[PDB]
Curated annotation (Swiss-Prot):
Biological role: May be required for DNA interstrand cross-link repair. Also required for checkpoint mediated cell cycle arrest in early prophase in response to mitotic spindle poisons. Possesses beta-lactamase activity, catalyzing the hydrolysis of penicillin G and nitrocefin. Exhibits no activity towards other beta-lactam antibiotic classes including cephalosporins (cefotaxime) and carbapenems (imipenem).
Protein name per Swiss-Prot or TrEMBL: DNA cross-link repair 1A protein
Induction: During mitosis. The mRNA encoding this protein contains an internal ribosome entry site (IRES) in its 5'-UTR. This 5'-UTR generally suppresses translation while specifically promoting expression during mitosis, when cap-dependent translation may be impaired.
Tissue: Expressed in brain, heart, kidney, liver, pancreas, placenta and skeletal muscle.
Subunit structure: Binds constitutively to TP53BP1. Binds CDC27, which is itself a component of the anaphase promoting complex (APC). Binds PIAS1.
Source organism, top-level taxon: Eukaryota
Range within the parent protein: 700 to 1040 of 1040
Subcellular location per the Swiss-Prot or TrEMBL entry: Nucleus
Membrane-spanning residues: none
Annotated gene: DCLRE1A
Impact when changing residue 139 to N: Impaired nuclear focus formation, reduced interaction with PIAS and increased sensitivity to cisplatin
Entry's family note: Belongs to the DNA repair metallo-beta-lactamase (DRMBL) family.
Length: 341
């Protein structure tokens, strides 16, 4: 049944709750972003109102064929009224179109649902700064101190320098980047830009990227693989067998692959700096796993919460085990005692 942490008390609202059938007493279904664990259950036969960002609304219509009459896109950073309740959508610094949702309950309670997010000090100057938040439904994906990772900027610097060096040394090297969902587009876009190429991909992936309002996108991507030296493939194909196969398909245009897997975290991070990352190699194929995260590190998460000072925290991630739950609740208490709220 729908779990309590997807329900907004004092409202007819749910968040990211599309796989439980008709939820008793839900008048509006919010969707924070277009990732499959969150939209699981939506299709063209859905007949309740869906509230979301403009970009999420492009994807629902074009990829899942939800009918337009049931899609309710809202602008960001704007006070809006939904079934008599004031809401605001804020940028979540996750994937394109991902939002956090502020709800202003009729009784005076203020609730923030982060969706999936990567906490950033820039959020400390949105409409969040202007009032107190009583309850926080928090993306706790990496809520443990072992989860450190570099900034997105440091990681892109590494990938750009790596790719530019490899291809300048060997003009017949191909760069491949893996993907399985929207998000992390900077990886492949920044590499293509330094090499002066477009990124080549399947028709299905080109379609998906055309929904994202990325400026100058027609200048950056293409379905013509033959004209491109950066190719996108399914994440599943980023291994030695899958890459040998793809190299065969390129018809002797290339004699070397350098491939990137943007992982979230990998325990090489406890010991190793980004400077120090090395690939796995077999023959003329090298694979780098790079720690490009679209979720908060433990420190980023801590700073956000100690700034916000919520009265109650409700985790939305890692809630399935008692050990996880008890570990998170210990960190919440430390943070509160250290900051004094
Ligand atoms: Ni997500």
């Amino acid at each position: 049944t729908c779990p309590f942490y997807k329900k907004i008390p004092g409202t007819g609202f749910t968040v990211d709750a599309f796989q439980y059938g008709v939820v008793e007493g839900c008048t509006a279904y919010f969707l924070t972003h277009f990732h499959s664990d969150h939209y699981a259950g939506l299709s063209k036969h859905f007949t309740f109102p869906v509230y979301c960002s403009e970009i999420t609304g492009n994807l629902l219509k074009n990829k899942l064929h939800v009918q337009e009459q049931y899609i309710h896109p809202l602008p960001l950073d704007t006070e809006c009224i939904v079934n008599g309740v004031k809401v605001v959508l804020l940028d979540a610094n996750h994937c394109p179109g991902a939002v956090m949702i502020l709800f202003y309950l009729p009784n005076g309670t203020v609730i923030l649902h982060t969706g999936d997010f990567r906490a950033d000090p820039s959020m400390e100057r949105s409409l969040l700064a202007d009032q107190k938040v009583h309850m926080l439904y928090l993306d706790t994906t990496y809520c443990s101190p072992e989860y450190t990772f570099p900034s997105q900027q440091e990681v892109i610097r590494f990938a750009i320098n790596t790719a530019f060096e490899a291809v300048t040394l060997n003009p017949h090297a191909l760069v491949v980047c893996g993907t399985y969902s929207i998000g992390k587009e900077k990886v492949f876009l920044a590499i293509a830009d330094v090499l002066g190429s477009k990124v080549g991909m399947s028709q299905e992936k080109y379609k998906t990227l055309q929904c994202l309002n990325i400026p100058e996108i027609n200048s950056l991507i293409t379905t013509d693989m033959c004209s491109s030296l950066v190719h996108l493939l399914p994440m599943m194909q980023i291994n030695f067998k899958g890459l040998q196969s793809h190299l065969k398909k390129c018809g002797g245009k290339y004699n070397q692959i350098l491939a990137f897997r943007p992982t979230g975290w990998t325990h090489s991070n406890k010991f190793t700096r980004i400077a120090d990352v090395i690939p796995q190699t077999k023959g003329n194929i090298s694979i780098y796993g790079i720690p490009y995260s679209e979720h908060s590190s433990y420190l980023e998460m801590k700073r956000f919460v100690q700034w916000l000072k919520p009265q109650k925290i409700i985790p939305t991630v890692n809630v399935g085990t008692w050990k996880s739950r008890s570990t998170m609740e210990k960190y919440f208490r430390e943070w509160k005692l250290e900051a004094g709220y």
